[PDB]
Design a protein around this nucleic acid. Structure first.
Lengths: 60, 258, 123, 226
RNA sequence: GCCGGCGGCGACGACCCAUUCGAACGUCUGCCCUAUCAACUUUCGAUGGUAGUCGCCGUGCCUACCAUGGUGACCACGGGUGACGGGGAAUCAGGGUUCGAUUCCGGAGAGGGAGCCUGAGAAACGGCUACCACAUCCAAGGAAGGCAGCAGGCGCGCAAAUUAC
RNA sequence: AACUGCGAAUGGCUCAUUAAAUCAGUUAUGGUUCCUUUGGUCGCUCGUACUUGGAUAACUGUGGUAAUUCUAGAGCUAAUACA
């Protein structure tokens, strides 16, 4: 027994299909427009939006 | 396991103390006394966490061992002594007197009282028995066994005891149209008036209580405590008048105050 | 250029204390040492800096503010009695003996193996 | 074989090294706590009868009173038994113990002088002995000095004279436990006081309840007239 | 201290009742695979009855004398489990599948079994007694053992940290 | 230092065992025990007391065995120990 919490959460979801033109473009546009470091930062915002949308959908 | 348990893990402690996770692994572990381990409050929690007097565990025993704190007009140096419902904690150093009443959301609130009201306490009678040349006896929720009770006192009635003596000043019968308080279950800490009881032989009796704001709820007989005669209470109430107002108007009240 | 504020005070008659939350505003310079906080607080409350005890100073990110805990005792006797030994030892009012847990627990387990007055002789 | 000879009267004791069979044949084939006439030992022992109190065999194991054998034996020793002291409460150990009957195969024999003889053996009887401490219980002091109930004990208490280099002498006396002092009488009248308090408490409570019940059963009866 | 006795404030105790912390026996409903396990249990208690014994008590718990019962394709009984059981975890449209030795709750055992002292509480293992398996010292007479506590070492293996304060 | 009181039955570790067993939710002890705490009870009994008895540690002194938190013999002395 130790006085520590193990409450840790993943903040991004990887895409189903790894290589797909039309998608890669759309993410690179977002990076290019808002000077983001890597595609993790786009997936982070997609994941947060998705969770807000799922909360709205299950409330409706 | 073999023999009785001596420790208590922090997360396994009852929720209405509001101990945080990271402070330690263990908890206070209320010692044996008049009130149940699940439904009491250690003095270490009351002093350190609620009154914000002591910071560490050492400061609490440094307060208590100097004999500045009485419970029901009797000096207790045990920092893990269980003080429960209706118990009057007296600090005669700073001249502050507290009665342990549950608040709306179901926990012991830091409710101060005048020193004049810290003279008596209300108590629910658990049983009534007689023995050894028939001096009848009474037993109450805080384990105070009293000899020669008033024969009008039946089981589930409330009695008012002067703390300096150990004698009954006055008593309230458990009848329809009496002010009660809930001490167990979902409705813990709600004050209201009795409407009726539905006797279920060989099982728990259920009572229906109407709140001051037209809210009607049910509860088991064991989790009822008569506090007033008719509608008028015989003790001071917490900040709120025991009215369970919902999350909607909780938010409205909080946003209105801002 | 340091400004001292106090946040949540309390007059703890139970431990003969005045306990408070110290807020230090120091924009340009480093985290101010405890002795300067002590004397400036002592000057603010018109008391000796000897009977003041401060600790737990966490300087905010950016370095404009530092929040800590402070307490002033009614007299040095109540301070000597009530305050824990580790906070005396920093002021230099208490001395710790230079022995390790290994050494004392070793000598204990050696001291077990002899009965009578010879327990004191084994050293 | 050696003889650990002690004289309780003088409180002196000496270790004798005897290696002549002739002198020890008197002691062989005898049990513990047996009176043996010590003559064969030497000239100085003319009229000395001596008791056999203990001893150790060549391995160093001690002998018990009650074991009616020659060699050693394994005994489950508990509280009360000799050759053992428990570490925990009600904790028993099986240990090797020598038989009560003495033989030639003994490292030492423990001898205690019960009576005298003509002349004092050097080591023991010549040198004086002092039993140093005495009487802590009041009645022990009274029994020692034959003091009647009128006579005081603190006057005739033992005083231990104690002196050591680089400090003036001290005379220390013990705290006489079980001695009647005004404090003890005060505790006794404090004990008897509460008995009076409890009886008057019971009587007053009973009287009050009797007066209460009287009107209770009067009003209870009154409504039964309808 | 009060007019030789009478007393206030505690602390240790204490038969018994109540209480708190429990603990122990039960009630109802719920568990993975297997028919290449279809009948099982009752000689030596299986199911029930009467009387006791023993136990902290209720009871085939045990003894005596009687009755011939009790469970079973709604899967008994037997065997297997890389089975401690839950609160939970991973995944996921809805339904589901898989994991849960592991920090909270309950159970169990201190190499394997068995027996017991003390105590309110143990069939205790950082208590004892014996046997079985391993193994330490030795003057060969005897003596002393228990890491599945924290470190650490050996072994095992694809697989896991510092003889710290 | 030692006698006496209490604790050492909690904690920690691990998952071998265990398939209506463990365990979970629900009820029962009107069929039982319970250190401790907190109350009650404690001249309710009709028959040397202003304090009774004996020992043993500790300590001193003599020892044995190659050996262990092994212990025997001798001389005193305590109680909220034992009576």
């Amino acid at each position: 027994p130790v006085a520590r919490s193990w409450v840790c959460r993943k903040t991004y979801v990887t895409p189903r299909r790894p290589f797909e033109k039309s998608r890669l473009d759309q993410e690179l546009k977002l990076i290019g427009e808002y000077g983001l470091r890597n595609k993790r930062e786009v997936w982070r915002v997609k994941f947060t939006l998705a969770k807000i949308r799922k909360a709205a959908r299950e409330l409706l | 396991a073999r023999g009785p348990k001596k420790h208590l893990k922090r997360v396994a402690a009852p929720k209405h103390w509001m101990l945080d996770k990271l402070t330690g692994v263990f908890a206070p572990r209320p010692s044996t006394g008049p009130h149940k381990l699940r439904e009491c409050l250690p003095l270490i929690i009351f002093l350190r966490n609620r009154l914000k007097y002591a910071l560490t565990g050492d400061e609490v025993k440094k307060i208590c061992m100097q004999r500045f704190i009485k419970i029901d007009g009797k000096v207790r140096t045990d920092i893990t002594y269980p003080a429960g419902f209706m118990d009057v904690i007296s600090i005669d150093k700073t001249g502050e007197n507290f009665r342990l009443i549950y608040d709306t959301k179901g926990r012991f609130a830091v409710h101060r009282i005048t020193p004049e009201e810290a003279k008596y306490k209300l108590c629910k009678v658990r049983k009534i028995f007689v023995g050894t040349k028939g001096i009848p006896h009474l037993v109450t929720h805080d384990a105070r066994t009293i000899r020669y009770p008033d024969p009008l006192i039946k089981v589930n009635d409330t009695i008012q005891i002067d703390l300096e003596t150990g004698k009954i000043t006055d008593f309230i019968k458990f009848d329809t149209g009496n002010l009660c308080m809930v001490t167990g279950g979902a409705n813990l800490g709600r004050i209201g008036v009795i409407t009726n009881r539905e006797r279920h032989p060989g099982s728990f009796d259920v009572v229906h209580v109407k709140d001051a704001n037209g809210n009607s709820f049910a509860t088991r007989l064991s989790n009822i405590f008569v506090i007033g005669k008719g509608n008028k209470p015989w003790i001071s109430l917490p900040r709120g008048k025991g009215i369970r107002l919902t999350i909607a108007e909780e938010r409205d009240k909080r946003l209105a105050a801002k | 250029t340091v400004t001292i504020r106090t946040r949540k005070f309390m007059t703890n008659r139970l431990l003969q204390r005045k306990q408070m939350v110290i807020d230090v505003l120091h924009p340009g310079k480093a985290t101010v040492p405890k002795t300067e906080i002590r004397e400036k607080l002592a000057k603010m409350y018109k008391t000796t800096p000897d009977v003041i005890f401060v600790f737990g100073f966490r300087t905010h990110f950016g370095g404009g503010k530092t929040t800590g805990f402070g307490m002033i005792y009614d007299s040095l006797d109540y301070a000597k009695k009530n305050e824990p030994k580790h906070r005396l030892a920093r002021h230099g009012l208490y001395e710790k003996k230079k022995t390790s847990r290994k050494q004392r627990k070793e000598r204990k387990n050696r001291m077990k193996k002899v009965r009578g007055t010879a327990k004191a002789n084994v050293g | 074989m050696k003889l650990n000879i002690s004289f309780p009267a003088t409180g002196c004791q000496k270790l004798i090294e005897v290696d002549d069979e002739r002198k020890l044949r008197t002691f062989y084939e005898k049990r513990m706590a047996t009176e043996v006439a010590a003559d064969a030992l030497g000239e100085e022992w003319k009229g000395y009868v001596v008791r056999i109190s203990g001893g150790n065999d060549k391995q160093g194991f001690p002998m018990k009173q009650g074991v009616l054998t020659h060699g050693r034996v394994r005994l489950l020793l508990s509280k009360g038994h000799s050759c053992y002291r428990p570490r925990r409460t009600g904790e028993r150990k099986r240990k090797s113990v020598r038989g009560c009957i003495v033989d030639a195969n003994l490292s030492v024999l423990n001898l205690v002088i019960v009576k005298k003889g003509e002349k004092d053996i050097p080591g023991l009887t010549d040198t004086t002995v002092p039993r140093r401490l005495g009487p802590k219980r009041a009645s022990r002091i009274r029994k020692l000095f034959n003091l009647s109930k009128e006579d005081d004990v603190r006057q005739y208490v033992v005083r231990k004279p104690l002196n050591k280099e680089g400090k003036k002498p001290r005379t220390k006396a013990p705290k006489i436990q079980r001695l009647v002092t005004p404090r003890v009488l005060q505790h006794k009248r404090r004990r008897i006081a509460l008995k009076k308090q409890r009886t008057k408490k019971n009587k007053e409570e009973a009287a009050e309840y009797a007066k209460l019940l009287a009107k209770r059963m009067k009003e209870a009866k009154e409504k039964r007239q309808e």
